[PDB]
Symmetry: C5
Subunit: 330 residues, 5 copies
């Protein structure tokens, strides 16, 4: 009896709020953006409510599935995703819409959607960071006085596919919560949350960034073991180490997020750069002192202490730095 | 009585202009494009007007929320964003539209939209710049004689979310204004403005750009303290420092905005490059003078002054440059 | 008699399930993304079923072709692609839809669609890896009690275009299968699968990555055949070889997948890098020992063993590593 | 009286052609793509014509504004942009359409559109080039016998926003013209043209490209003043200068247009590269001659002329090249 | 008399096939993608057929042009592009559709469309390659028994714009062909082909890639003319040349197509790399032999043949390689 009723008014229009239950199955997590600070998810969204205007006579007490072109002729709750950037409903080969109605008016409605939603990421410990994210569901036009939104089975209303995986992150700790939201100009609304945690894998970053910089720092210590008389052997080695470290730094910066603070990897890289710089300065000082001594001996007419002490001081300083660093950012 | 009226005509058609009030809540600022000089904002837009054709009997003077499919059967204000590049209305899971009507005909109409709009950025002080942006709302079809547009609550009609954030900028000073606009061929219209100010964070740029250039300039000064007899040691240091500075400049230029004037960072980088070039020329001059002196000695049959004066002159000049630069731009 | 029936209800509504057969012809395989882990396909999809509501009088028992605007007036199966990211129906110059009806109600329905679908990839043997993929077809609203989905001709139902070719992969082993799916809140559904296997071509990687690293290792081995007394000849060669290998590694990393586990190419490149590093350290040790001996003889007042042994030891270790590597990874 | 007419037929159907006037205001120039040779423009397009089927009684002879849903119910001129690649009408918060009708049937119709259209470009003088572009408006379905398209006022029909600007170009000389177009299979049509000129800002390219190459040539000239007995000093400087120039050329080539002819900047860069190459060859010749003479003198048992002549010849040749180059391309 | 007919059936439904002629004017060739293997074209597509149901009384025997909203109420041929990736019809400021009807029922129907279509490119001779491409037009629903598709004027039915051009290719030899296509499940269909040939310009590659590799190979040959006693001159030169060649190869490989076989440019580049490698090995051999002879002289107590032989062998071998290469690949 579609044609006999006005479906621009909710069930119970003018009376108490109508309960609407929600059930979600998560299908996949498609991508994460560190410059845009958002994520994309595909899910099946289910609604439960009753409308006495949709009853029909039957002897079986069983639900029937209808084509889905009928959805545009009846009242349907208006859910939307808060703090989202873009979304759409899949529609091949037809709209991905299910409608099942029982003889007493109970309705099950189901959509397949894709949502891109924002989140606040902290990179102060990158690439050792851990992030938390949430997707928020809320009705748009109806306040809690007209429509009451809740999880259909409480904590049991959220399911996930076994094939959910991201190549760069470990996904854990799915759960659901609720909260009441307030708008100064419209009223009070009930929000539903889907929360989860992401843990990044660190092997790639270690192998591609920490390994080369440490190797170049250790290469800069070769200079201390070379006879100081070979100036065109010790100067080129230091300057080439500086050039290699700078090129590595640029190549790494080509792929990094940009924030108003500095990530742990930046601290590591610039400490290595300063170490190489100080090695070059030390050799310059040694050469100057040797020349001065030669001039004084001419006027009057072995390993230099600085080299033999730096051979111990430099490795100790780097080892201490690494101990503190991997005790803090473990 | 939707079917009993013609809603292609405005309320008060043929008579005085109909007042329309506006109220905006800002949800987020998504991105800033320095190449295209624009920004993307998501907001809630609310309209207020009275229409006697939409009155209905009641007892409680309370507004009732209707489905939202009636927005295409009644008259609605026609507003658009001026100097925008693209925009859309969110439509998952349905159109994000609210409609509330009071018994006497007062209407509340609400939309959720995403808009990309342009702004004129001045990069002459980059990366220390400050920009002023604005978003403009105006009616399209109706001049001020047909439609009167104003802020609903004065300067209290703009609200912002606590989660507004940008990774590169600090946002401040949201406020609203009005101004009359004129088109030669159509008439006079009234604009509404939303203004805000953006200030860039500078630590990332300092560490990634200013620090390595200073370090390379300081490394170019070691040549002054090395014995002038070691030509195959002093020449490679200068040419390698020049090469490293060139690679750093290229890597920096890869990510910068292009303008017909110079930004502060380019001034700093090219002054450093000139310093390294001059150091190479100084060693060339010393070598030539030494050779000439030796030739004179042969035909007749200590530290060269240039080095001992350059060791003082170069750091003093660079410090003077840094003082002037960081007093001008700070 | 389109106007005499209600086509919001399936044929057999209230009774046994309606059998629906499926045929597919694959037209092309468009692209593969190793970052988002998906593939794009264009195919022709065909549906077969009977509907006695679509009969008409005739003497020929021959199919008639109808315009295709009639598709939106009649009941049609609602197939969708499981685990897909986006899809669309081509619509130039009109919708690519065919409708062909026999006098007794047998219906042939055909669409041209493009689908992007996700697939999990294992990159541990990259670039020698073999990948498998599948596309899944299922009904959205009807369970196996309402709709019976099957392959129309069993194994003969899948045809492919002669022109299917990807520049990076060899495509083989197309075949089909079926499985029964379950959703905890809706019911049981029958899934159809299209399976295929990809084999990557390896010539490009052999030319671009393995060759330069081997050449650089053999170039670094030159150091052991140069007289050890030429320190400013032997040190620069090693440090420049390290710089070149780092440049090569960065250039290769620019185009490689990022996973938490190590790929074969990364193992090869970093083993080569360590070989060069060890060569530099060996020369440093030789220089130090020579200087120590000279000082000892002065206090008391030919080829060094290490170089002679390294000329044999280094190539043998590299050849053994290569044999192991190419036995493990084929 | 919309419902009493058939609006598939133009006014005057079967008789003389209906005149249509056009007036345009340009709002912005959004972007320019040198790779694809196109530009993006946003404009307001206005149409003027008379249709007596749209008359109505009135007492004040004043134009009235209608909702804009009526455009789809009445006849409208069908203008399109020739040689465009894509376009759209802005539709937030509704279609940006104005419709004003006078009591005697005169109609004003106004659209806000964004068009991307091609502009052919000659890069032979890049980056000192000047380009011209045009946007073309034409009727699709009606020939000059059915529709007469003209500029509503003349040269005064084009207005531009005060804020139109580009980050790379100076915009000048907006004006209009008309021409008659012919299609072999359909007929003759009127075209309207909007013409403008773009001139590039040179400074950025000068500083980023010409300055480094000149500095590197002047650095390669340093070799001529170094004592010819310092072979391990003179060879590295030349080879490192060549490497630096190659790196600069690659970094610049990352950003340049690709055409079948040669741009000016390529001429400058490759001439500089040839100069550095020649400097290296001259040093090689000097060393060979010195060794030959030394061997002859030993068997029998000052500055070399080539160096003293190169010190004069190289700067003079480069200065002559610059004097010619900056005169040809002005 | 639109409402008096059922236009869901083709003209002649139940009888012989209806002839449809096709006429095409090509407006532009917009882009070519070598990574995707496709191209984009904009064209005007014209159809001719007769329909007695569209006859109307008249006195002038002339064509009448209709609005184009009638296309959704009458029967229209269903052409589509085979092996296409995406396409659309331009719709600014309205649908770019023309419809003309003669009194006897003959119809001219015209569309302006943009199509992306695939092409199998062969890059063996890149960048000296020549490619052929085609665009295919076919009906979707009607077999050759129901609809006869043919060129309206034979080979004179294809016209091309005078402004068609591509920056990287020369376009030649537009012509048309036809063929009969078979589908195993549906039937036989007529296809129309639009052919063209593309020739790549090679000046860009000759300047950017071949020239510097030849220059670096010739720079490697300088070492043979340098006194062999200057080891720290001849070793650094070779290693720096190797580094420069590797950087050049990386920079050019950054942008080139990837295939399972080797392109001509990679053959040239890697042969050059091998030449530089062999020069380094030759100098190492010379140094070792000289040291061995000096040791023999010590135990007993001119230019080396290898260098003077290589001064002839290396240039001649490179010349032979170039003569063969430029004779095979033209
Ligand atoms: C630019 C580079 C690679 C380095 C720089 O210093 C080095 O040690 C490298 C070397 O290749 C070897 C040595 O000849 C060099 C020189 O004097 O400066 C340069 C030369 C060319
Ligand atoms: C949920 C529901 O409606 N259940 C009904 C039940 O009340 C009734 O007794 C039965 C009769 O067979 O049919 C079913
Ligand atoms: C869901 O989990 C939360 C975790 O804190 C818990 O507080 C809540 O009681 C749980 N609800 C159900 C229904 O299990
Ligand atoms: C509310 O009702 C009172 C009467 O009780 C009336 O005076 C007042 O105008 C009403 N307000 C509105 C906004 O309709
Ligand atoms: C709103 O407040 C701002 C605060 O700076 C003020 O400048 C402006 O004049 C105020 N406008 C009105 C209408 O009160
Ligand atoms: C086709 O016609 C034959 C008679 O020649 C008849 O026996 C058969 O049932 C018909 N088939 C269909 C599908 O109508
Ligand atoms: C049917 O074909 C598929 C193709 O992959 C094959 O796997 C399967 O074994 C075949 N089954 C039979 C019964 O032939
Ligand atoms: C213009 O308007 C005046 C009234 O101001 C009216 O008298 C006159 O007839 C109108 N002219 C036309 C051409 O409509
Ligand atoms: C419009 O003005 C321009 C100004 O340069 C002129 O070139 C052109 O001929 C004028 N056209 C007409 C129609 O007056
Ligand atoms: C040609 O047109 C005239 C009307 O001008 C008409 O009378 C005549 O029948 C037409 N001839 C043909 C062959 O259609
Ligand atoms: C059209 O021209 C092509 C050119 O190759 C030729 O093959 C074909 O036979 C021609 N057809 C006609 C009808 O002239
Ligand atoms: C194989 C990875 C080694 C990483 C070492 C990191 C030392 C800080
Ligand atoms: C044609 C390239 C061959 C590369 C072989 C690499 C062996 C480690
Ligand atoms: C700051 C621009 C310098 C340009 C120098 C050009 C020399 C030919
Ligand atoms: C200006 C183009 C030079 C091309 C040289 C090619 C040498 C093989
Ligand atoms: C800059 C190093 C100088 C050393 C003086 C002892
Ligand atoms: C070498 C540091 C490893 C740290 C692992 C958490
Ligand atoms: C955040 C660092 C600021 C430094 C100002 C001199
Ligand atoms: C404002 C122009 C500055 C140029 C500096 C080289
Ligand atoms: C080219 C500069 C050298 C200076 C010697 C007088
Ligand atoms: C398993 C990690 C190997 C790293 C070799 C450098
Ligand atoms: C790195 C120096 C090696 C010294 C071993 C005796
Ligand atoms: C390679 C240059 C040699 C010069 C002989 C005059
Ligand atoms: C630049 C000074 C040159 C002197 C030549 C004798
Ligand atoms: C240094 C060349 C400047 C040219 C200005 C047009
Ligand atoms: C055509 C490929 C040849 C490869 C030779 C190693
Ligand atoms: C590595 C090549 C050395 C040549 C003398 C055996
Ligand atoms: C002395 C010049 C030899 C040239 C051989 C090609
Ligand atoms: C096709 C021209 C080749 C020129 C090689 C020097
Ligand atoms: Cl580099
Ligand atoms: Cl480099």
């Amino acid at each position: 009896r579609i044609d006999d009723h006005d479906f621009s008014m909710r069930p119970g229009f003018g009376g108490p709020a109508i309960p609407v239950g929600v059930d979600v199955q998560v299908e996949s997590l498609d991508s994460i953006s560190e410059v845009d600070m958002d994520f994309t998810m595909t899910l099946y969204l289910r609604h439960y409510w009753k409308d006495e205007r949709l009853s029909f006579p039957s002897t079986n007490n069983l639900s029937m599935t209808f084509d889905g072109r009928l959805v545009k002729k009846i009242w349907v709750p208006d859910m939307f995703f808060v703090h989202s950037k873009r979304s759409f409903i899949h529609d091949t080969t037809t709209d991905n819409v299910m409608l099942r109605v029982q003889p007493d008016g109970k309705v099950l409605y189901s959509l397949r959607v894709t949502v891109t939603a924002m989140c606040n990421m902290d990179f102060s410990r990158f690439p050792l960071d851990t992030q938390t994210c949430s997707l928020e569901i809320e009705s748009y036009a109806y306040t809690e006085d007209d429509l009451m939104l809740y999880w259909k089975k409480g904590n049991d209303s959220l399911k996930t596919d076994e094939r959910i995986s991201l190549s760069q992150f470990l996904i854990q700790e799915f759960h659901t919560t609720t909260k009441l939201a307030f708008y100064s100009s419209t009223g009070w609304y009930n929000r539903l949350y889907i929360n989860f945690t992401l843990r990044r894998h660190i092997f790639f970053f270690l192998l591609q960034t920490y390994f080369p910089a440490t190797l170049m720092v250790m290469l800069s210590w070769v200079s201390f073991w070379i006879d100081r008389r070979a100036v065109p052997a010790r100067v080129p080695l230091g300057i080439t180490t500086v050039l290699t470290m700078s090129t590595i730094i640029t190549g790494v910066n080509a792929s990094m997020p940009r924030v108003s603070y500095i990530k742990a990897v930046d601290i590591y890289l610039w400490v290595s750069f300063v170490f190489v710089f100080l090695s070059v300065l030390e050799y310059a000082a040694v050469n100057y002192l040797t020349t001065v001594q030669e001039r004084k001996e001419q006027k009057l007419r072995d390993t230099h202490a600085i080299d033999k002490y730096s051979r111990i001081i430099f490795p100790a300083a780097y080892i201490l730095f690494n101990l503190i660093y991997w005790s803090i950012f473990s």
